[PDB]
Design a protein around this ligand. Structure first.
Ligand code: HEM
Ligand code: HEM
Ligand code: HEM
Ligand code: HEM
Ligand SMILES: O=C1NC(=O)c2c(NCc3cc(F)ccc3O)cccc21
Ligand SMILES: O=C1NC(=O)c2c(NCc3cc(F)ccc3O)cccc21
Ligand SMILES: O=C1NC(=O)c2c(NCc3cc(F)ccc3O)cccc21
Ligand SMILES: O=C1NC(=O)c2c(NCc3cc(F)ccc3O)cccc21
Ligand SMILES: [K+]
Ligand SMILES: [K+]
Lengths: 156, 156, 156, 156, 156, 156, 156
């Protein structure tokens, strides 16, 4: 079913953010596991998988709309080098992600692509949950101290 | 445990091929599903997952060797536009992949990184199984004809 | 709860489309079964049942909003005489139904009937799924040939 | 128990035919598997296994009769280059085998080795079942065409 | 996947050794069973089966590498006339087998056919296990005496 | 089966390293248990058991190759006096063990003792896993602090 | 709990004997397995494990008493060259062990370390059971003859 060209462009822009997220969260996960912070590693792995599921649904919608999913262009990964900075990199990425989702939804609404809108709303819901998670972790580091926060994420 | 620098370079080169494969096989999978060729779609999905598992193990080894896994640089996806060409693109990618695995193993053997060698041998085994699969599919298209081959991959 | 007069008019228009589809899809199903294309017959039966469910929910929403659900004014059924034509007739009907759905959602949004909109969006998602199925089948007739396509739909 | 010398010679002749069939059918099975024709590969594997079981029973009977089972002399394998040739090579072998079985049964009856006869009759029943299968496959190739015939033997 | 010509020649040589072993061990098994030494017969049967499995894997690898598996040429069986001779015949055959496997592994390593090496290494492990069994049996005959050794192998 | 004299010397050297490790890790385990660091005690016990298993397999391989396994010449145990020191003493030992493993594998490869190599490679993989654990613990002492690290290892 | 200095010396002496027995019995076990005398090999393995458990308990007792368990000094292993000698070597070692146990219990009683005495008494009961086993095996070698005795220990 031939879709709106600019909608497909938005979907592909959203897909690009998810593809960045997949790799950034997967790398952070395995960095945390390597450091013995297995609870962070497992959670961040699950964030990676969730972005993979989002990318899948975007790929599928783009193909249905008879566009070409762009998996070739990979934007810049925000890889941190310690726990506090990795969380902030994830958060910075999510704030960019939600901004683009909102702009995409605006355009879907204008051209009446209500099904695409619904898909992007569902993704936006998951990304805001991720932001909640990240904001909470950063807040906890201040409340309990970095050493305790890391201690609490050694074991699953 | 600090690894050999050139070994880590090889591992990262292997990882780059797997990252290309992940996206190429995932896209082909969803293209086939979109076309109603669900048996090809499901198989190619499983090839994608297998490359994901390989990438994971490479990322983990690189981190253990105290290198930096490169998930930023994404080489060129060989995306075909019909079944015969998609299979050939996968095969062309695998023949490149196995060549690089062999060179990587040569160097691991020289510097005595026997554990890395074992990991790359296991990956090489999976990639040669994939080549077998691809060569067989291409051969079947000739034997049964394209229309029958596609018919036989409509339903799972 | 007194609803907007024109919302109810839209809902009754969508209802009218679903009533055509019920009968069109049911007849196509029984024609395919009579021809021994039992897999098409079964799938088309489930398409008819799905439209019956949408009709039910429209009738319920109209009665809640204190309108009169129009089950009396049956529009034109698009019945094919062979499989390719029947699939195309379903597609043609679905493409009108989705245009009317989008127009109804526009109006629901204007007058703030957000629950009616949500219902129409859910129905729209179904109908686009039906369009995906129908386009996929017509593409498969091309890719594998008519004789093979029909063969693959003889047995469930 | 001292058997008749000519009976033992016949049993070794039947054994020799079975040792050819074991290898011919095993190789044909693995060829069909390599080509993706896994239904033929599996069925031919089971034919090879059945010949192994016959060979076992012949070896056991020859030893009971105080003869020396000949596993050293391997006759000519009839290996085909395509499916039609392979099937016809199997059939040519089976027809030689059943001829030899009948001549061996005649001699067992003449010298009153009724147990050896009963063993050979059971093997003969198995070989006639393989001939039925082969003649049926060759006829199916004519009825449905080679492309369809190979299509139907891709999947198990 | 086109393999190295000499690797394939090596694989066919190893296949030739396995084909001798299959028949030699199968005949020894059935001789021991005929003599009432059923524990020896059973164990020797399982050695024959294990060689059959090795031969299968070699055939499959040769065909994947686009060579022709040689099941036609059958080398000399080493058949003993009593238990001690039969065990020593098996041991002589195994010592030739492992010499050939080492030479083939050398060549696989030199041309970087690492998957073929791994296959031959696994077969070599099984053959060294068989050498261990055989040397151990020959030793037990000396320790417990032949009559006791045979007594211990009457009943499974 | 007569093995290479120097292979057996290497195997006995690896064996000697495992015998030190068994005793070193067992004592460390019981020291941690006595101090109430039961999670470290349990984990170190399982490290000791794992070395016992490696020792067993080395002893078995040496006896198969007709050498004399040296369980008599116990080298120097590296016992720490506090947790950080004990972990470092384990790491120091593992780093010598892996160097000796790589030297032994070099020689096994030269004289074509591929089964001994395979055994040593499997042991090497274990030992590198142990190194990963030990480095991770020493890094965690930094990241979370000593008091927190010890606290997290009081209870299993 | 600070223990008596000479109690701790006795416990380390007992521990030293247990450490010898661990290695002597483990090597004897694996020699018997290599020779195909698997029932002896299994029983001797379990004797080695029992000494391992006694060593554990002595190490734990010494640490509780604030001593340093000596796992560094390994006394002379008594290794036989045949079954008869191996059993007698074990028995000679056990007879020195029980001597040293009795002298340690005397001292424990004198200084009122009644819990250490109870531990040593339990270990003495195990060692006297081992002496019973060993004396009985040497008696059986006489009563059934060496060939029969060895025959009865081939199979588990
Ligand atoms: C750095 C690149 C990637 C890595 C390291 C990675 C890793 C993984 C791993 C370890 C799994 C679990 C599979 C299993 O154990 O069964 C997985 C699952 C999955 N991956 Fe990835 N992946 C990567 C990229 C992608 C991409 C780019 C996509 C889609 C475009 C994707 C889609 C999926 C899906 C759909 C699943 C299944 C999740 C489920 O269980 O429902 N992955 N991935
Ligand atoms: C206003 C028009 C119709 C409405 C609102 C309607 C509604 C429904 C509903 C709600 C169901 C149950 C679906 C479920 O499983 O949850 C159903 C079932 C069914 N409908 Fe209709 N339907 C309509 C017309 C028709 C027509 C014209 C036919 C046949 C010509 C038909 C044939 C069937 C059949 C065979 C079933 C399944 C009955 C069973 O349980 O065995 N329907 N319908
Ligand atoms: C003297 C020649 C042979 C004899 C007498 C023989 C006999 C047997 C027997 C009795 C079985 C067990 C069948 C059952 O009861 O299920 C068997 C299994 C088998 N044979 Fe043979 N065989 C021979 C040659 C071969 C050859 C040349 C190959 C392949 C190169 C082969 C491959 C196999 C395989 C793969 C199995 C299945 C083993 C398993 O996984 O359990 N055999 N054979
Ligand atoms: C040559 C030296 C040794 C060898 C070859 C050896 C071998 C083994 C083996 C193979 C096991 C069984 C592992 C399994 O679960 O599969 C074991 C268990 C064990 N070992 Fe050792 N060991 C040695 C020294 C020691 C020492 C010195 C100690 C204590 C100081 C010890 C304490 C233990 C304990 C407590 C167990 C578990 C027993 C149970 O099942 O409760 N080992 N050993
Ligand atoms: O398709 C039809 N949907 C209807 O509601 C309907 C009819 N409704 C009569 C009616 C009027 C009213 F003012 C209040 C209640 C009520 O039932 C009559 C004929 C046909 C249809
Ligand atoms: O396929 C072969 N079948 C055989 O029996 C055989 C051989 N016989 C050894 C033998 C055993 C015996 F119990 C009495 C006499 C005797 O010669 C030698 C090579 C090959 C084969
Ligand atoms: O740690 C030890 N590993 C041993 O093999 C060993 C001993 N072996 C004696 C022996 C010699 C022989 F030529 C044949 C068999 C045999 O058992 C003696 C003392 C200590 C150890
Ligand atoms: O056998 C040893 N037992 C120890 O407590 C110990 C050490 N720690 C003080 C150092 C070296 C050896 C040993
Ligand atoms: K804390
Ligand atoms: K067909």
């Amino acid at each position: 079913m031939k879709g709106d060209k600019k909608v497909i462009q938005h979907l592909n822009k959203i897909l690009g953010n998810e593809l960045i997220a997949i790799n950034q969260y997967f790398l952070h996960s395995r960095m945390w596991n390597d450091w013995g912070l297995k609870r962070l590693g497992a959670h961040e792995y699950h964030e990676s998988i969730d972005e993979m599921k989002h990318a899948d649904k975007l790929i599928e919608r783009i193909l249905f709309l008879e566009g070409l999913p762009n998996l070739q262009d990979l934007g810049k990964l925000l890889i941190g080098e310690n726990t506090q900075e990795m969380l902030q990199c994830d958060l910075n990425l999510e704030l960019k992600a939600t901004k683009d989702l909102r702009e995409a939804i605006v355009h879907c609404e204008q051209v009446h692509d209500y099904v695409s809108r619904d898909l992007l709303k569902d993704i936006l819901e998951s990304e805001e949950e991720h932001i909640d998670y990240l904001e909470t972790q950063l807040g906890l580091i201040q409340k309990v101290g970095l050493e305790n926060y890391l201690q609490s994420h050694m074991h699953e």
